[PDB]
Amino acid sequence: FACKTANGTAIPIGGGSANVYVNLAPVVNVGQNLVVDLSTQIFCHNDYPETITDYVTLQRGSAYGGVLSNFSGTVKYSGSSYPFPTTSETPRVVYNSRTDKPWPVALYLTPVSSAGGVAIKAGSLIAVLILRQTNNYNSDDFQFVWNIYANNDVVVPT
Amino acid sequence: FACKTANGTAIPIGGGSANVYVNLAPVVNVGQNLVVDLSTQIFCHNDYPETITDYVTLQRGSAYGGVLSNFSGTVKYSGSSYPFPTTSETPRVVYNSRTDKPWPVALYLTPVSSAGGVAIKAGSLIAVLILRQTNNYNSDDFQFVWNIYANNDVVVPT
């Protein structure tokens, strides 16, 4: 089981970490949503799908930088909504093909009432997402860590 | 690491169970030997030998049906004799090649004094043997269970 990003960065069998740089709306008003759709960035596959089934969860998700200070939000995993920063591990998603398939995660972040000015500085870490892989054959519990960085500033007009 | 039989039946990575039907000597006299050579039926391989070596043992084995009722015997594992039913684990056999190589197990059974008539009925379960795989790389401890069935009657003439 391994995972790759869009621009090529990869995390091998056994786990590891990588940096994903995401584009954000340059301007977002209080009450609007800022969307980070990782389903178009992170892709994972099962290296022996014929006999084995891979199980993937969001073990935790955490907010950093300006998203922590100036945003509320939720994460949507495989059809269901959960708070972000995360308060529990999510249900499992199955990976059963050697073909790279997306990780169905999306962050919805909305500036809070007191938000104003520059709320996210470009290049800064805005979240960390921990993907947990297990399977149906052994006790493997692997962590694929994704450090999410902003490609641009985000301004919340006041 | 997986194991296959000659007739196609297989147990995949991680372990499992299977039913193996073996041809038996149609007739065996008291004082003669009945031989069940699984080394010519079960074969196992190592799927990544470059970094890891797989360790295989005969963990335990039990007799059922006519082998339980009408035969005494021992099991021979990789050149050495052991009690049957086996209540203790055997030394290890090494697997470090992708080439299918035999599981060196063979049962040597002799009819008991009172044996006479059909002593093994065709189609019946005659034994259960548990192959245990471990390795030098992971915490993998898998059981490949082999349920041994007789393909034909066996008669002990009196």
Ligand SMILES: CC(=O)N[C@@H]1[C@@H](O)[C@H](O[C@@H]2O[C@H](CO)[C@@H](O[C@@H]3O[C@H](CO[C@H]4O[C@H](CO[C@H]5O[C@H](CO)[C@@H](O)[C@H](O)[C@@H]5O)[C@@H](O)[C@H](O[C@H]5O[C@H](CO)[C@@H](O)[C@H](O)[C@@H]5O)[C@@H]4O)[C@@H](O)[C@H](O[C@H]4O[C@H](CO)[C@@H](O)[C@H](O)[C@@H]4O[C@H]4O[C@H](CO)[C@@H](O)[C@H](O)[C@@H]4O)[C@@H]3O)[C@H](O)[C@H]2NC(C)=O)[C@@H](CO)O[C@H]1O
């Ligand atoms: C970038 C980098 O180098 N990363 C490191 C990484 O390379 C390294 O480890 C290994 O990576 C190899 C990359 O291909 C792996 O090779 C393949 O293995 C497949 C089987 O994988 C399953 O089995 C392994 C080994 O464990 C089992 O087997 C051993 C051996 O007996 C035993 O001890 C165990 O108890 C158990 O029985 C597991 O590790 C795998 O687990 C991972 O994947 C599963 C599935 O997603 C997860 O559930 C699990 O949690 C792990 O994430 C699997 O369980 C082979 O099927 C595969 O076969 C093809 O390629 C070889 C190459 O020659 C051919 O010879 C072979 O015939 C076969 O070819 C066929 O199939 C190909 C595609 O399938 C096709 O292209 C061919 O044309 C042909 O059709 C291959 O051998 C290797 O398994 C990895 N090893 C381990 C231990 O993970 C790791 C290790 O530290 O570090 C990275 O950094």
Ligand code: NI
């Ligand atoms: Ni792969």
Ligand code: NI
């Ligand atoms: Ni194999």
